[PDB]
Ligand binder design. Structure first.
Ligand code: SF4
Ligand SMILES: [Zn+2]
Ligand SMILES: [Zn+2]
Ligand SMILES: [Zn+2]
Lengths: 329, 265, 714
């Protein structure tokens, strides 16, 4: 299934009073903030070209906590600040969705717009009806996948399925990581969603030519001191401290070669390995992947290389490495 | 109405960065300000929205020889039992009315990724393979073969800053603020200049903006060297050449694309 | 999905059936095979009709001679409309399997008020007014005048229906009330009468109980033609109340005053007739000598002779005398009086009215009323009510009682006394159904134990089967919260009702539950007066305001218009994220009428056991007789009525499609073994002893856990 390589996802978090209640081990608001940091940090680590923007809705008002950006450190910093947030009020889904729609209305067609709403308080007081907004979202091809907390609220139930997103509820804290972790992967592009080519430029890192000859002093582009060398642009010719950052001038995405290669594992997902507990003529006592003795009645194999991988290797290969070690050969 | 005038007053002093740079375009009398903007309690409120009767009473009972505190007093003020049920349903109904305003993927060439963007007889394999096969029949030469005083010492000298493989000034600080102000100045105005440049815009209405922006590039950059001249003629140290690239490269893109336009015609 | 039942092969449209369904069909077939009346309970409101219907369709084809027609009744027309849809879906599936049309006809009857096509009666909504207009249009005089074709509005639909509808019967098809109305318009025939004619040959006929219980109307449409028919009632747990209410007739001072004025109009009408038309209308006297309907059932009904009353002048005085006796006997100021057999003796002695002439008064009134060519019966409807009461008392009083209330409750002094004639046993009015029809299946949900019904209704069931729904996921999660955070008894006892803590506990439970319960929730109180006191106590405290902050709250009132608007707003709240807390009374008409589905009434709350004001004499007479006869303890029936009624309103949350919904009983009484035993099997068996006495906060926590498990998909 073709996926949305570049996606603009908004993590809407409810500043409702119900977040004050502690059903989980820590304060519920802190836990979501603590875990949301993992998603934000992991979200870019598995989709660099994408960009994220967080919104916090409290006291019936939706305030953009952070605009769309490509730097996980900036977003994570806001999460740390938001830990001490008052968290007193009632959320307004219409306000939150409306705020996201305005920013996402002007986004380019190629990108896959998305929204992730962490719903905590089942109540949703809104200035106007949301069903009109729901119709607008579908015409806006925005995928809203709510993640409720302790409630299978009907209003969100139609929202996810009607708008094309997915709805879920937190069975427990451990299950909470699984739910957000699922949204890290680029959701498949549906029939309604379309695709198009996107222009990009690769900023060659440059430093002083020859012992500060014809040097290129500059400070930064969003107390930065003078920098001997920094990333430039094919068109801006502006010194960008770090990548990948959208051209503050061109509006064209700048991204290094490795970042694009980071997302190729999505295109070619590794075929799962059949699990056979018995030895089944496998005369190698040591696992091939890790050269370690198999202390469990479990084995994994490919359909091409036909190698042997223990539970640890198969868990690792399908979790992080996203490729078969031996089958590369 | 004078909507723009009110907006300017709100941003006149509330935010320095926005107004600071806008004036600079007029400090030297570069271009008209028209193109600048053209291109770019709760409790009473709840009762105001909830109860229509209070809204009607407020308009008719607008403060006149009275006090707001007295008005607050008027708020809280078997048949009586039914009133609570009727009020709450009416109150709940009013609140509800208040919030209701009237594809499988496929590919043809996957080998290209494996040898991705990064760019770049037979007997030799046989000859080399056999020779190495007989190499290690003598092993454990560690006593002396691994390193020597001369070989080890040479490595240390190389690792020294003078040696090979080990290659190895914030004097201006007040000027830094001006450059940052200038950097924002260029960025603020380049953004509009580059706003329409990437898109061809084969339309007179959209293309007219390009011509005005294209001409405006000279006007904004006409005054730029004058500010540069003052800073340059201070100590002739820590030359600022990067700021020139954006302007000069903006010129080259302007001149080249403008020239390309003539060829297309 | 054909099912090879032990008795035979039964077609089934839906993909799969739970194990309980297997038991359902075989259990039903057992009674049908035995051709004996029985009673059974099945939890699911939806899918029960098709499973019940599915066997009948197979049974009819297997043994067409055994069963003539199916008479499947439903409580309310809004609910019978959805039933025929299930039958229509089944017929298409069965017809598709066969591949050709089959001799199967299905239709639903109803009152002319609900369905009709005549423009004149369309604007009117009152049922009584509709009959008066229709009766006038279809009156023999109009029909006789229609032959003359004089200048007068004649209802064309009935005129052409007689010439056309009589000759050609509809071969087959399924026609709901909405569909039936359209058919009449295009064919220019009565949706009502056309259905009435179809009853002669209609495999499946469905209509409300009031078309099958009251002898006034049920008997005529339910003639002996159904010698062996599978008559079935649905959700007929409160069958006795509907069955008894058919017999009960209420006479009031306002009604009596209307009768006196109506009688005067009747006297004036006769005077006009005498001077205008005497000979032709006098012929009816010969017809009377030769020899709106009487409420007497088949055997009880008598038509020997009109009696002494034979002329309008004589008969009118007869009503005049009887009206005066009731007028005086009603005006008497005293304690509530009971005199089932003595009232007949008292009336007979006081004003010299023998019962036998008085028995035919109701029938004579209709016969005499017809001779009067009256404009409509709506104006004279109260007079007929007295006539119906007049004949009913003179007919029999063994299982009845005349109750006179000079002073009405809730009023220190009221000048509008009401004379009650409430019955005491439902077997009397339902007796003809059992005898006329070989077997009756009283299918119902939330049914309190079956053994009582044969005691309440004089019948011998073939089987007493209780079914508990079996699903891969445990949809319903019942619980009883008898102890609050204060660990204080929370029983809503009449003496303990005044407790502030008990009132506070309910607000605490609702407030806490409202926090966790998603959009859609309903709370049931015991009575309107108690509900207001609880609401007022919460209103004075901050509990109500906190509840308002948590979710929107709606209360219910006696007037239907307010209830209709409030209920519609409630459904709007659930659709949006606001959610609504609809406070209602268990015995209020809103609870029985409304149905709660997914994201509607998610957590039904039963605040206190539902009990009526024991001071109500009418209930005492009914209660006393059940103790006097059939050997039922006074408390046993009283608890049974509450348990059956408490389960009635709270069992809607599990309508169907395995939509998760929890039921919380806010009273320690339910935890008692006696209450649980009377609880329906499906609700009872799921309920466990561990969660039986959950604390208010403890119950909230488990409810939050329960939602989590149900929230996740399959
Ligand atoms: S005769 Fe038929 S069409 Fe006319 S009012 Fe009666 S039911 Fe309606
Ligand atoms: Zn650029
Ligand atoms: Zn291994
Ligand atoms: Zn492999």
């Amino acid at each position: 299934v073709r996926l949305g390589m570049m996606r603009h996802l908004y993590v809407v978090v409810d500043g409702s009073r119900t977040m004050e209640d502690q059903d989980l081990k820590p304060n519920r608001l802190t836990c979501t903030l603590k875990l949301l940091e993992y998603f934000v940090e992991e979200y870019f680590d598995q989709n660099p070209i994408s960009q994220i923007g967080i919104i916090v809705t409290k006291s019936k008002r939706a305030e953009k906590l952070t605009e769309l950006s490509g730097n996980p450190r900036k977003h994570i910093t806001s999460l740390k600040k938001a830990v001490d947030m008052t968290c007193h009020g009632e959320p307004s889904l219409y306000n939150s969705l409306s705020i996201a729609m305005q920013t996402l209305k002007h986004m380019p067609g190629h990108t896959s717009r998305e929204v992730l709403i962490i719903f905590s308080s089942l109540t949703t007081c809104d200035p106007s009806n949301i069903y009109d907004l729901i119709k607008t979202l579908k015409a806006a091809k925005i995928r809203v996948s709510v993640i409720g907390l302790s409630a299978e609220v009907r209003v969100c139930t139609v929202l996810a399925r009607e708008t094309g997103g997915t709805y879920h509820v937190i069975l427990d804290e451990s299950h909470y990581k699984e739910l957000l972790t699922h949204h890290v992967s680029p959701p498949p592009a549906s029939s309604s969603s379309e695709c198009s080519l996107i222009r990009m430029g690769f900023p060659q890192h440059t430093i002083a030519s020859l012992s500060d000859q014809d040097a290129k002093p500059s400070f930064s582009m969003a107390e930065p001191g003078l920098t001997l060398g920094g990333y430039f642009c094919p068109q801006c010719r502006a010194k960008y401290c770090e990548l990948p950052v959208e051209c503050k001038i061109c509006g064209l995405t700048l991204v290094s070669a490795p970042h694009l290669a980071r997302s190729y594992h999505h295109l070619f997902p590794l075929d799962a390995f059949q699990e056979i507990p018995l030895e089944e003529y496998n005369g190698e006592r040591f696992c091939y992947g890790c050269q370690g003795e198999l202390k469990d009645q479990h084995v994994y194999v490919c359909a091409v290389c036909q190698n042997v991988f223990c539970v640890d290797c198969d868990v690792f290969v399908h979790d992080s490495l996203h490729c078969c070690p031996g089958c590369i050969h | 109405a004078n909507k723009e005038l009110e907006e300017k007053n709100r941003m006149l002093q509330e935010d320095p960065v926005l107004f600071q740079l806008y004036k600079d375009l007029v400090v030297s009398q570069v271009i008209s300000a028209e193109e600048f903007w053209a291109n770019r309690s709760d409790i009473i409120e709840s009762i105001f929205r909830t109860y229509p009767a209070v809204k009607m009473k407020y308009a008719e009972n607008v403060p006149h020889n009275m006090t707001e505190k007295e008005f607050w007093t008027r708020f809280f003020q078997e048949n009586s039992n039914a009133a609570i049920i009727k009020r709450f349903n009416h109150h709940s109904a009013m609140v509800l009315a208040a919030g209701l305003r009237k594809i499988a993927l496929n590919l043809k060439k996957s080998d290209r990724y494996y040898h991705g963007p990064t760019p770049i007889t037979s007997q030799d394999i046989i000859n080399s393979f056999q020779s190495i096969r007989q190499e290690m029949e003598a092993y454990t030469p560690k006593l002396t073969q691994v390193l020597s005083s001369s070989a080890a010492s040479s490595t240390i000298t190389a690792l020294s800053p003078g040696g090979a493989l080990m290659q190895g000034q914030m004097v201006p600080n007040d000027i830094q603020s001006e450059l940052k102000h200038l950097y924002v100045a260029v960025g603020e105005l380049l953004r509009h200049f580059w706003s329409c440049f990437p898109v061809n815009t084969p339309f007179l209405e959209e293309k007219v903006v390009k011509m005005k922006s294209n001409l405006e590039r000279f006007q904004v950059t006409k005054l730029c060297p004058f500010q540069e001249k003052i800073r340059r003629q201070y100590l002739s140290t820590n030359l600022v050449s990067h700021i020139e690239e954006m302007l000069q490269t903006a010129y080259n893109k302007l001149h080249t694309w403008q020239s390309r336009r003539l060829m297309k015609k | 999905m054909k099912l090879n039942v032990d008795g035979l092969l039964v077609y089934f449209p839906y993909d799969y059936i739970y194990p309980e369904q297997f038991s359902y069909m075989r259990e039903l077939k057992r009674t049908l095979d035995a051709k004996g009346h029985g009673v059974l309970e099945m939890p699911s409101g939806t899918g029960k009709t098709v499973s019940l219907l599915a066997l009948i369709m197979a049974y009819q084809r297997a043994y067409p001679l055994e069963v003539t027609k199916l008479i499947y009744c439903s409580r309310t027309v809004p609910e019978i409309e959805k039933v025929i849809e299930e039958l229509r879906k089944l017929l298409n599936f069965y017809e598709k399997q066969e591949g050709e049309k089959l001799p199967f006809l299905g239709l639903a009857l109803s009152s002319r008020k609900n369905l009709c096509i005549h423009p004149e009666v369309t604007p009117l909504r009152f049922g009584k007014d509709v009959d008066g207009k229709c009766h006038s249009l279809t009156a023999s005089y109009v029909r006789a005048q229609y032959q003359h074709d004089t200048s007068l509005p004649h209802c064309r639909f009935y005129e052409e229906f007689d010439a056309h509808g009589r000759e050609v019967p509809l071969p087959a098809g399924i026609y709901n009330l909405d569909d039936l109305k359209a058919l009449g318009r295009r064919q220019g025939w009565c949706p009502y009468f056309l259905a009435r004619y179809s009853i002669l040959h209609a495999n499946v006929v469905v209509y409300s109980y009031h078309y099958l219980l009251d002898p006034k109307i049920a008997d005529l449409v339910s003639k002996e033609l159904a010698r062996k028919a599978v008559v079935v009632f649905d959700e007929a747990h409160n069958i006795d109340n509907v069955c008894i209410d058919s017999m009960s007739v209420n006479l009031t001072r306002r009604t009596l005053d209307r009768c006196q004025g109506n009688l005067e109009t009747l006297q004036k009408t006769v005077l006009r007739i005498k001077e205008t038309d005497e000979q032709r209308l006098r012929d009816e006297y010969r017809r009377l000598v030769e020899g709106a309907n009487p409420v007497l059932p088949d055997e009880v009904l008598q038509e020997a002779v009109p009696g002494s009353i034979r002329t309008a002048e004589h008969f009118l005085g007869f009503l005049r005398r009887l009206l005066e006796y009731v007028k005086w006997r009603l005006r008497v100021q005293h304690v509530v009086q009971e005199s089932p057999p003595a009232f007949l003796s008292g009336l007979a002695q006081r004003v010299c009215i023998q019962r036998k002439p008085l028995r035919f008064c109701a029938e004579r009134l209709r016969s005499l009323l017809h001779t009067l060519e009256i404009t409509d019966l709506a104006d004279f409807s109260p007079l007929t009510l007295l006539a119906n009461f007049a004949t009913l008392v003179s007919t029999y009083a063994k299982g009845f009682t005349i109750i006179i209330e000079p002073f009405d409750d809730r009023t220190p002094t009221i000048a509008n006394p009401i004379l009650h004639f409430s019955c005491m046993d439902a077997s009397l009015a339902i007796k003809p159904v059992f005898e006329r029809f070989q077997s009756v299946i009283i299918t119902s949900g939330t049914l309190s134990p079956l053994d009582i019904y044969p005691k309440i209704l004089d019948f011998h069931p073939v089987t007493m089967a209780t079914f508990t729904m079996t699903l891969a996921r445990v949809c319903l999660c019942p619980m009883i919260i008898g102890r609050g955070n204060d660990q204080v008894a929370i029983s809503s006892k009449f003496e303990t009702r005044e407790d502030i803590a008990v009132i506070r506990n309910y607000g605490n439970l609702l407030l806490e539950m409202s926090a966790v319960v998603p959009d859609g929730i309903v709370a049931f109180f015991t009575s309107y007066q108690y509900m207001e006191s609880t609401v007022a106590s919460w209103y004075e405290q901050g509990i109500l305001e906190n509840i308002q902050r948590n979710k929107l709250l709606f209360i219910e009132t006696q007037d239907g218009a307010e209830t209709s608007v409030a209920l519609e707003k409630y459904q709007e709240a659930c659709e949006n994220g606001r959610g609504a807390i609809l406070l209602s009374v268990a015995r209020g008409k809103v609870s029985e009428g409304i149905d709660f589905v997914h994201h509607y009434g998610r957590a039904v709350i039963m605040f206190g056991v539902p009990y009526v004001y024991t001071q109500s004499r009418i209930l005492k007479a009914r209660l006393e007789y059940l103790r006097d006869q059939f050997q039922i303890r006074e408390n046993d029936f009283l608890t049974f009525d509450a348990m059956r009624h408490a389960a009635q309103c709270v069992g809607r949350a599990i309508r169907g499609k395995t939509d998760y919904g929890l039921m919380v009983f806010a009273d320690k009484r339910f935890a008692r073994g006696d209450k649980r035993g009377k609880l329906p099997r499906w609700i009872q068996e799921h309920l466990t002893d561990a969660n039986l006495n959950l604390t208010v906060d403890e119950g909230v926590q488990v409810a939050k856990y329960f939602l989590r498990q149900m929230a996740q998909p399959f």
